[PDB]
């Protein structure tokens, strides 16, 4: 109800609940590049998998290689012409699609590269297979670091995002789970996910982002919802450099009230490297410990949840955070020492599993967050195809990426 300014408590695992974790990964997701000077690069997933494949975490969880989504599946939310354009555009014939490159906003903000359709299909199939496995009870927590995009609209490509696999996973979750809650904990607010469920009540979005004429420009205490979606779109705008304790104090009570009033049957988490320490885009000061503590807080209630990797521009920090999140989801803590992997020389000079908080000024005053939370809780008072729905995915357990050499 009021911002209590409680200090950052340690990350309690509370192992009373044991969650069967299904990690979805494809070896082909890291072999696609946007180009030099571009913030988005899917190569960060490969080292996130490598850190996962170097802690012995495969002995506590199920690895999965999802079948990539087809045109009949990504068109469950996107228009047919957008998917038809995306499956034929390559960076050698853009002049033949000069109209559709600016119609669907595929220019310089979202460039064209080889395997773009393949990467989008991989991400969509991963999200779909994770949601189908969560729906049938085959897993307790589904991990989808291999691709996840919140900026993608119905027929618009924006935010270095092309295919909104999050809404596809939510749609898959919507066929059995009635009430789904989408939690966003990064900067560059998920306007695509929020606007895709703005006028519905069975799915509501909660985003902790940055406002003040940032890149998305969407997210406000007045952005609440229209039609049947009134009081079913929650935005918590934050200023620059919110630290770990401030993020905990602004994250835990609103989540507690949200699930004490909405009580969702499914959770979609959008953890990412956008709200981490100093990277190419983003101004938050939330370190590894607070970012993992938010997810561990979400893990404390034992709700069947989705964790989806989103942004990330500095691959070492986002890989460290995703590895610690995977370890926390398996009811264990990881040592700060980094094991020897294929990207041993990639990480920082300390070579430790830690993202250092950049000592910069925090402008999130207690009274601003107090009035934001009072407005949010006032808005919260009223809250009281051929092979779709497919759980068919390859096991992919024979592969390994663990290094046992010098």
């Amino acid at each position: 109800m009021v911002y209590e300014a409680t200090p950052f408590d340690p990350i309690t695992v509370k192992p009373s609940d044991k969650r069967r974790v299904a990690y979805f990964y494809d070896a082909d997701v890291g072999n696609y590049a946007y180009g030099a000077g571009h913030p988005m690069k899917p190569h960060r997933i490969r080292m996130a998998h490598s850190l996962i494949m170097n802690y012995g975490l495969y002995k506590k969880m199920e690895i999965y290689r999802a079948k990539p989504a087809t045109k009949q599946e990504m068109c469950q939310f996107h228009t047919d012409e957008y998917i038809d354009f995306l499956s034929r555009v390559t960076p050698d014939n853009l002049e033949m699609f000069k109209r559709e490159s600016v119609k669907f906003n595929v220019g310089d903000d979202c460039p064209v590269f080889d395997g773009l359709y393949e990467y989008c299909s991989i991400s969509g199939g991963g999200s779909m297979e994770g949601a189908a496995r969560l729906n049938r009870g085959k897993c307790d927590v589904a991990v989808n670091y291999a691709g996840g995009l919140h900026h993608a609209k119905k027929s618009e490509a924006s935010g270095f995002c092309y295919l909104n696999d999050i809404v596809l996973g939510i749609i898959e979750l919507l066929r059995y789970h009635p009430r789904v809650l989408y939690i966003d904990i990064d900067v560059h607010h998920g306007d695509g996910v929020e606007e895709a469920f703005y006028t519905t009540d069975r799915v509501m979005t909660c985003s902790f982002h940055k406002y003040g004429e940032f890149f998305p420009g969407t997210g406000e205490l007045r952005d609440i919802g229209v039609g049947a979606g009134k009081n079913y779109a929650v935005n918590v705008p934050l200023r620059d450099g919110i630290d770990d304790a401030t993020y905990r104090s602004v994250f835990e009570p609103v989540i507690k009230k949200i699930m004490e009033w909405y009580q969702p049957s499914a959770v979609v988490l959008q953890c990412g490297g956008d709200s981490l320490s100093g990277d190419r885009l983003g101004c938050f000061n939330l370190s590894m410990e607070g970012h993992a503590n938010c997810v561990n807080y979400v893990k404390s209630f034992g709700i069947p949840m989705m964790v989806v990797g989103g942004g990330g521009y500095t691959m070492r920090n986002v890989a460290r955070t995703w590895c610690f999140e995977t370890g926390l989801l398996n009811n264990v803590v990881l040592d700060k020492d980094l094991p020897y992997n294929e990207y041993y020389e990639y990480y920082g000079p300390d070579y430790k599993l830690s993202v250092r908080p950049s000592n910069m000024f925090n402008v999130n005053t207690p009274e601003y967050l107090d009035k934001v939370m009072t407005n949010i809780f006032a808005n919260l008072e009223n809250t009281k195809e051929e092979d779709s729905a497919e759980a068919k995915d390859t096991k992919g357990g024979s592969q390994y990426a663990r290094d046992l050499h010098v």
Binding site: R99, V102, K103, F104, N105, K153, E156
Partner: protein, 182 residues
């Protein structure tokens, strides 16, 4: 030469300019205030309320000339660059439905006001007898006064976010991408 226009219609035109260029809005293709019915209503209202001393022939000549001028004037100096794409879409639809396009019947009175505002420059563009210019300007001023007499019936402000019939709809991002930047 010179035209005197009511100030309320000038404010309506400036609001149209704001809605198109700044607020990025376009008029509704299913117009209920179209140029043909508005001109016919004006002609009948000024013809059934007074006698015919021979000036009604001149008024019908002016109405027919305005209709013929709006038939082919809409695609040349009207139609801001944003709303050109809707015009192309309806032209393609009309050509697909084997029907020649008549913009008098499917465009509202805002474009008629735009034509009236531009009309002095078109008058100065061509070489005309001055008495003909004075007569045409007098008829245009009388029609503008009549339009001011029914300003609320044909021009009403309504937010498209709160109502579906507001003579102005929002534009999708695909519309902005195709119409502007290409």
């Amino acid at each position: 030469i010179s035209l005197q226009i009511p100030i309320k219609l000038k404010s309506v035109l400036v609001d149209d300019w704001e809605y198109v260029t700044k607020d990025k809005k376009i008029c509704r293709l299913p117009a209920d205030v179209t140029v043909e019915m508005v001109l016919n209503k004006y002609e009948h209202e000024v013809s059934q309320e007074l006698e015919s001393p021979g000036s009604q022939s001149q008024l019908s000549e002016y109405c027919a000339g305005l209709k013929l001028y709006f038939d082919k004037c809409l695609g040349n100096m009207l139609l801001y660059r944003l709303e050109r794409l809707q015009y192309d879409e309806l032209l393609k639809k009309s050509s697909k439905d084997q029907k020649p396009l008549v913009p008098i019947r499917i465009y509202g009175a805002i474009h008629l006001l735009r034509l009236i505002s531009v009309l002095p420059e078109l008058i100065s563009s061509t070489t005309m007898d001055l008495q003909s210019c004075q007569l045409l300007i007098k008829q245009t001023e009388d029609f503008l006064v009549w339009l001011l007499m029914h300003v609320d019936e044909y021009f009403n402000d309504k937010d498209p976010n709160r109502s579906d019939d507001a003579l102005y709809v929002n534009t999708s991002s695909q519309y902005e991408g195709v119409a502007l930047g290409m």
